[PDB]
Symmetry: D2
Subunit: 396 residues, 4 copies
């Protein structure tokens, strides 16, 4: 348990860093909401805290943690700024996805930049064609979380021939200098995430920064004893677990806020001048809190399954991954229902622009509908695993 | 059934008016959201359509309808602009509340103004003291829906003596010329309702425009055959039923929108490229639709109970009113849960500023937490009626 | 509204009959539970009350009511004996189904027997082959509600040729003298319904007592002005609405019982020595009661849609029938969830054999899973109607 | 982690014992249901397996495990016989409660009987009066789980003086030879548990077998390094956690059964001839499974909190105990809702006496309403902890 102790010690330290830098992130909430991008101070704090480096390899100066640590960090980050938490989660996840690329690419990205920050969008395909020494890539990729502050982007594309017929799927790593960002992110939640559209036209991408779509989604590294444990982790599932953690954390912040304010407000137009005087209020809050507790456990269970497998160098069977997909959708669904309950508890005041409760409500609800967190898809995937049905998603 | 036919004919005509003027209200949504008040064109349309006049007496040129008609109008209005619907509902309800005042006041308000529009705020008390010929009134009343466009306001206050000791409760009718409006309405939903703060300082209010709080909440007119049936209606309960209708209508619009868009969108990242191809999606939508249908029936049942009693000139017993309070909270609770479900159905796109789905979601959620719609209070009131417990609210 | 008044008067009279004969049905609950059939006194009371005759034609001495009346009768019956209610509902529904047969069959059944009682099972197919003057029928039909007391049975079969190849579907009317009943009904709920297996071997059925399966499910009589309104009703949907009413009524009886007992019991091991002293208990009960109220409205809405169409001699479109299927599944689902809630309210004592609460719980739960009440199928059917998908059931 | 490994090894061995003896328990289900007591073979198997000895001290030849082990054993036991599981859980819990008594009593109970089996009923008070050398005890105690097979019983009583005035609360240990059992357990679930009434009349109980009620509920041993860790455990909370495990396990067995049968049955009257062909069915089952998974985690979390505190010799603060009370009520509530869902999945066949599904449904539902598992009380307790309100139960 020497390593177990070490990993726990680091997690605590990282959680304490979140608390230390949290007032900066909180301070920039108003500007972020207004401008739909993270303020400069927040980006600075992310680079100084090293919170973008949790899933970066030690060989490049990264912290190289595990899923559970990243999850606990994301939950605490959300208390201060759910958008920052979301971006930080996306960066670490993108960096982890980068590890499927060759060493040549990884050196080019992380070699002189321990704090390198990647975007990744699987939400579109662009079209790529072979050229000498690489590919020529054209496309338009929406939902590019944190792309304004990112150094590189992993983009999905379809390879085509001279005729324009489909050849196969690709994953491509392209630098900020080669990208253009189009202002398309106009939403009512997660505004500062800056999930704008990445645009490429006839852009050259060399061969060493391109892998097959099959390789990008591969879980063959699960049993590779040569790799450190983090790079054995099922990456896509891990990313989904930390996205759920962002949502979860916002829900938990919402709960803490309602608890904080309940002794000094009433329930109009009742005789209950203090919320805590109403037993209906108190018992309801207990129930809502237990749903959020359940969501937390679903997330932690999935994180632990992923880490245990990576540490033991075993492959997670499909049934276990299908269950993880169910856990994450179920956790965020539980959180959105609980937020609705917390607004009923708090009252009309919760919708004031000055009240953080509506911020958590809007950010968690927006983020929860991310595709990898879809509750109905998760339900169908987990249910299907009981009978060995063909999954309804292309990769796990 | 001659009258039954007549009342149905009028309702249909009014619903058709909503459709006719609806494109104007819809057109001003963006400005209303931006400015936190209804645009001039919307106010003009409200005055031309006579939709503020449903609960104004025929003797003054009003349409003098019933609860069910007002409810059906409110539901349809919400499709075009939930804020307009909310304001229109508040105006009619305020006008109905005005009927507790003496004829002298009613003549002063409606005598040369068939389209007079009242606000009413029970959300604060101001302090009033006797002066010769009336009272001197000071206070600050938040949540003044539609006050910027209103001609008069009904405000609650506490009478006090020279010593400053409490004497009793009052309801006071004061004109726009005597009011000041303070800009305090900064919310994330129902923005165009302009529910700002009304401020009064040492304002004179004459005796004929002041009644006891007891008289304002009175239901003694329930059995008065001299009055037309609308003025026999339990007014506070009626107002709550139409507030619920505003929320309900937004929910129904949300449902229609999700149905409209489902055949041309998919469920990422599944194999379902069309939402309608997924049986999980289809059956879930059926379930969500049945909750909204239940909310509609709760609202309609309460409206019908209120109208039947007014037409028959019978008093509703307390148990029936307590049940109505439960129905309205339960209906809006059902609607907010269903909206959460509709976002899961529609996906991440629902949170774009260009998508009406998030508008219905923000407006219905904000309005649902109005005090007269509190779901937990309603549950407690209805439950209590089964055992004859003392109600937890001061008036029914 | 002369007829409207008449129909309401009859319904009240029938409801009063249920109260009059209810103590007999209640008295035989223990024997019925023990023997898995209705006691002789109960059968006698059913014949004397004429409650099996609501959907029998006036021309044969039947009461010829409508769906709403049958529904309200079923709900009240369930308070005394849910099994009796279930049987009575099945008999009326079977009698209504009989009206698709030729006049020759109807005369043979009802001509000298105004109180004739039919079974009907669509739960199996038997196999029938042409013979001169009719058919020879062999099969085994489970779930034959009330078959032990029934005079005739409507059984579904597949016609086959000499080769044994399928020809088509049939509905066959066969008398008690020709049937054999096999003891197969061993259940933990609805025990006295006696839903045993009907067995036939090479039984002759004449031509006039056989119709096509297509004719049995037909709704062509919806527009026939020659028929009285009851025989224009969509029969299968009507039967499903009254089956739901049986379940609903049991739920309502359960609610009344929990209300009755709450002031004299406590909530162990809390300080609440009286259930009514606990506000959590009271507010929860209010919520449960509103779900049951919603189930009641779903049932009533469907009944009214069916009656309005029959009275106006219009065909219900498919979308309206699909909605009715959704309403009935949703109502019974709401009732089973509410029963679970009522057990939480009442406590461990609810599971004693002496407590009627567990009887309502077991009977409503068993009956709710009847195929025509399946909640998931109803959800899929209603959801599908929004997009005009092919229904997942063969007939509506 | 040497001990951690050891404790895990023992748990696995015990779980394997449950599987070995499980066919005996399963075999006696029909007799147990019929006779309302455990069959002789089942009692024999309980004694041979040593499953009553998990919470008996090592010093007396007991297995002396922890909460988590007992919980995992209870869950697996329920698959074979929920009544046996319930009895076994009650025995271990009673044996753990016995450890508050003096060494003299413990020696008298366990000294020559490593497999001693205790009952315990807190559901009544009897009345006890001082006599020389002890007390004279009279009372009637219902809900005496497993009393027919038990060697001793812990019974709660109120001490009174000669006048008959109340003096204080007592806990009394009395042997089978001194007890009389009255046949009062007539229920529709958990029938074989034989939770009959214990009757005592003027029975002598010596001083060394009597402690104060305060001492019986005490948690002062939480920090006593002299005691083994099991006897430092918060006993009443531990007992509630394993009662919940019995219910949980029945739910899990129900889930496994529905999964097992789904490929060979259909959903009447739909086109889905195989349940697994229906995506609505599959996704619903996934959701139901995730609720049961959440219930499992709630139970495991509480077990772990209790064990970690016992091993570290720290006292659990009140807030942690209040949370455990919430977890257990919430888990069983989740299980009863999920069982309702599983019946909808399986269909009408689930209510046949031959189907194990209705057995799990009846046993889990009956046991869930035990006072220490009340969901509404748990919600109120956990909610209250957030604000430090006075708990609504007398002990934690
Ligand atoms: C706040 C927020 C931030 C987001 N950030 C990102 C991001 O940084 N990167 C990102 O890729 N996505 C991001 N997403 C989006 C997610 O991938 C989906 O695109 C989004 O939920 C819209 O789904 P849809 O059904 O509207 O998708 P669509 O419009 O259907 O997407 C189009 C196609 O992309 C495929 N697709 C979409 N998303 C994914 C995915 N995650 N993995 C694989 N295939 C996919 C689908 O199969 C579909 O064919 C974000 C969503 C939100 C709400
Ligand atoms: C969009 C929106 C529009 C609203 N418009 C109006 C409006 O036009 N007029 C209006 O009066 N209220 C309005 N309300 C408010 C409602 O009455 C409550 O004031 C509000 O829900 C907040 O309650 P609270 O618990 O924060 O209590 P507080 O606002 O803090 O209430 C203070 C006191 O006012 C009393 N009180 C508050 N509301 C009422 C009421 N409706 N009836 C009787 N007593 C009351 C309470 O019992 C308490 O004593 C609106 C709310 C929303 C969200
Ligand atoms: C208390 C109770 C009483 C019942 N009484 C009756 C009764 O009097 N008559 C009766 O027919 N059924 C009755 N049913 C049963 C119902 O029709 C279904 O048979 C039952 O729900 C079992 O469904 P399953 O999926 O196990 O049926 P299955 O065993 O799958 O049924 C066999 C076949 O018949 C078809 N089928 C079954 N029921 C129906 C129906 N109602 N309409 C059309 N097709 C059907 C199915 O599609 C299937 O192909 C009763 C059920 C219960 C619980
Ligand atoms: C299957 C089953 C098995 C049970 N087995 C047992 C058992 O072995 N031992 C046992 O004590 N109870 C047992 N119970 C019962 C439980 O303790 C409660 O008595 C029961 O839940 C009924 O509660 P009630 O509200 O009807 O209150 P009543 O039982 O009518 O309450 C009587 C008094 O006893 C007190 N009381 C009851 N139970 C408890 C408790 N568990 N702890 C502290 N105080 C209590 C209550 O405060 C109340 O003052 C069992 C219940 C079930 C359903």
């Amino acid at each position: 348990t020497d390593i177990r102790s070490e990993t726990a010690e680091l997690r605590a330290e990282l959680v304490e860093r979140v608390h230390k830098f949290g007032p900066v992130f909180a301070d920039g909430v108003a500007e972020g909401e207004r401008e739909r991008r993270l303020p400069d101070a927040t980006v600075r704090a992310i680079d100084q805290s090293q919170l973008a480096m949790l899933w970066t390899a030690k060989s490049y100066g990264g912290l190289e943690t595990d899923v559970r640590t990243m999850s606990e960090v994301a939950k605490v980050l959300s208390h201060y700024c759910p958008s920052t938490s979301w971006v930080v989660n996306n960066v670490n996840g993108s960096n982890l996805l980068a590890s499927k690329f060759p060493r040549a690419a990884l050196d080019e990205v992380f070699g002189d930049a321990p704090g390198a920050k990647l975007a990744s969008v699987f939400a579109a395909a662009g079209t790529a064609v072979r050229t000498p020494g690489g590919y020529r890539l054209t496309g338009s990729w929406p939902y590019g979380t944190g792309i304004l502050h990112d150094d590189w982007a992993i983009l999905v594309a379809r390879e085509v021939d001279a005729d324009g017929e489909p050849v196969g799927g690709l994953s491509m790593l392209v630098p900020a200098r080669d990208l253009t960002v189009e202002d398309t992110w106009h939403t009512v939640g997660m505004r500062a995430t800056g999930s704008h559209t990445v645009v490429l036209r006839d852009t050259f991408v060399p061969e060493h920064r391109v892998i097959s779509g099959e390789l990008q989604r591969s879980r063959e590294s699960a049993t590779d004893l040569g790799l450190p444990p983090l790079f054995r982790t099922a990456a896509i599932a891990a990313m989904a677990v930390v996205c759920a953690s962002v949502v979860l954390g916002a829900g938990q912040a919402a709960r803490a806020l309602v608890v904080e304010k309940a002794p000094t407000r009433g329930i109009a137009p009742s005789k209950y001048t203090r919320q805590t005087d109403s037993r209906t209020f108190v018992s309801s809050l207990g129930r809502t809190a237990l749903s959020i507790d359940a969501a937390e456990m679903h997330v932690a269970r999935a994180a632990t399954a992923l880490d245990d497998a990576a540490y033991d160098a075993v492959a997670l069977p499909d049934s276990e991954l299908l269950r993880i997909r169910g856990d994450v959708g179920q956790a965020v669904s539980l959180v959105t229902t609980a937020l609705d309950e917390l607004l009923w508890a708090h009252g009309a005041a919760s919708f004031a622009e000055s009240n953080p409760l509506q911020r958590y409500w809007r950010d968690a609800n927006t983020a929860a509908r991310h595709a990898m967190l879809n509750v109905h898809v998760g339900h169908e995937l987990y249910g299907g695993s009981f009978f060995g049905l063909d999954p309804i998603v292309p990769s796990l």
